[PDB]
Structure 1
Amino acid sequence: VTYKFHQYQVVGRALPTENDEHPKIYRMKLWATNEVRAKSKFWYYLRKLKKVKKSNGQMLAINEIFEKNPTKIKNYGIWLRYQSRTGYHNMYKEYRDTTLNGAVEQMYTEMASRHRVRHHCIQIIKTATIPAKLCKRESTKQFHDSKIKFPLVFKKVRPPSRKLKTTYKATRPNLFM
């Protein structure tokens, strides 16, 4: 099981000094492809929001967060702010996936596809597991059906592997739903 995006809890503080023997300890929940990039973004946010630089700061702890039950489907809501070609905007989106990592990957892909927003232009404000009744988007609410039933409208025809691939076939494919 490999996820492109991982969730980390990064803990850090400003370097102790004479004035502050025990400086405030700050924690963040961040998304990054690696722990190194997670720490980089943690220090970026600490510098921008608390005036604590990496040079005069201390790294305390970093742990990965894994989905409790990756075997079941959940509804995930993501509150984010992104930058467009003309300014900044806030955005709330909903996704269905077995893990929040998959939901975040879907969020990045959808932002790229629909708004041409690159990964570095997106800040995640909040994440949460939404119950079915509290979902706001029709896209997620359409699969909240006890008896869900539909045919496979679009299926791509291919051999099990390229071993059986042939340029020529005697008959055209026979497709039906």
Structure 2
Amino acid sequence: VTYKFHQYQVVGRALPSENDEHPKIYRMKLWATNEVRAKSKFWYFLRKLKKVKKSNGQMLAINEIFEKYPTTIKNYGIWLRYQSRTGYHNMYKEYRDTTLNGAVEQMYTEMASRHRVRHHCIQIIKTATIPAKLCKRESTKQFHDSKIKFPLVFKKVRPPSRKLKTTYKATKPNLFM
């Protein structure tokens, strides 16, 4: 329904000129929180990869890409480049989610946690839906089990809403797995 990160196809080109009346048309698949930020990052890469700045470029089309089957579970592989405190590195990550938007959200959260990498220090190189038999990370493999079975070792005790919250109770919580 609502995602932190949205996937967009951005299409643009250099402004037509007398030497090139039909300049090459470039497309990118970019992740951003909305259309405005997707366009800005599109010109960032075109400026540094194709030497086409926004001042001498033309925005053609921008469309948001939605997950095809948002009700099933897919394995998503993400190839990314990120900047640490001392240089640049490449890494491959895998995630399980119903939509690639969720998998990308997990990637940003994980990078912030395990590496203290902020959002603007990450470039997504490639994304793909990996079949179960081609996954590489064990964090994803262990859930490829037809007889998946485990208990809830840690539960969160709380009333359904704060309406039923009281400071004092006559007895302690009764918990059992």
Q: TM-score, normalised by structure 1?
A: 1.00
2:130 maps to which residue? 130
Counterpart in the other structure of 2:45: 45
- Following TM superposition, by how much is the alpha carbon of 1:4 offset from its aligned partner in structure 2, in angstroms? 0.5
2:66 — aligned with what?
Answer: 66
Structure-2-length-normalised TM-score:
1.00
Quote how far apart the aligned CAs of 1:59 are.
0.2
Name the SS of the counterpart of 2:173 in structure 1. Answer: coil
Q: How far off its partner does 1:30 sit?
A: 0.1
Deviations 1:119-167 (A, max 9, x none): 0000000000000000000000000000000000000100000000000
* 1:96-116 deviations in Å (ceiling 9; x for gaps): 000000000000000000000
| TM-superposed deviation, 1:8 | 0.1
Secondary structure in 2 matching 1:27: strand
Question: Could you tell me which residue of structure 2 aligns to residue 97 of structure 1?
Answer: 97
SS at match of 2:125: strand
Q: CA deviation at 1:71?
A: 0.2
Shift of 1:19: 0.2
Shift, 1:27, TM fit:
0.1
Q: Distance in 1 between matches of 2:86 and 2:21?
A: 45
Gaps of 5+ in 2: none
Give 1:73-152 correspondences, 5 Å limit: 73-152=73-152
Distance 1:173 1:83 in 2: 46
Cα distance in 1, alignment partners of residues 163 and 155 from structure 2: 20
- TM-superposed CA distance for 1:56, in Å, is 0.3
Find the residue that maps to 1:55 and give its secondary structure: helix
Structure 1 runs, 4 residues or longer, greater than 2 Å off:
none
Indicate the SS of the match to 1:45.
helix
- Give the Cα–Cα distance (whole angstroms) in 1 for the partners of residues 33 and 172 of structure 2: 44
How far off is 1:89 after superposition?
0.1
Cα deviation 1:30-51 (Å, max 9, x = unaligned): 0000100000000000000000
Displacement of 1:175 in angstroms is 0.3
Deviations 1:15-71 (A, max 9, x none): 000000100000000000010000000000000000000000000000000000000
Q: Which runs of 5+ in 1 are unaligned?
A: none
For 2:70 and 2:117, the matched residues in 1 are separated by 28
After TM superposition, give the deviation of residue 86 of structure 1 in Å.
Answer: 0.2
- State the distance in 1 between where 2:155 and 2:64 align: 37
